[PDB]
């Protein structure tokens, strides 16, 4: 029962690989929306000094 | 920061070469008014000498 013992166990490594790629994709899609979000906090501060600038102006 | 820099420097600046204009404006002015004195001086002695028993 040499082969069921080590199938068994391989499957379970599968799992386990396709799960920490799957919290590392997620990792991934985080890391991009906090770019974007910080992206646009960004923006919003520009728009806010663009904005008193011109006023003064 | 820079654009305030810009902006506060041509609101100094702008306001120094209006003061420096005005103060050339006011001097031209007075110039005008030596020289009316002058031109007005001419026309007197002018009369002066229209007077023989003066001119000779």
């Keep these: 029962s040499q082969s069921q013992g080590i199938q068994q166990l391989l499957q379970a490594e599968k799992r386990a690989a396709e799960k920490v790629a799957d919290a590392r994709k997620r990792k991934a899609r985080r890391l991009k929306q906090a770019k974007e979000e910080a992206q646009m906090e960004v923006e919003q501060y520009r728009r806010e000094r663009e904005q008193e600038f011109q006023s003064k102006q | ?56």
């Design chain 2, 1 to 56: 920061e820079k654009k305030e820099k810009q902006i506060e420097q041509q609101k100094k600046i702008q306001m120094s070469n209006l003061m420096n204009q005005a103060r050339l404006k006011v001097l031209r002015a007075r110039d005008d008014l030596i020289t009316d004195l002058l031109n007005e001086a001419k026309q007197r002695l002018s009369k002066v000498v229209k007077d023989t028993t003066r001119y000779q």
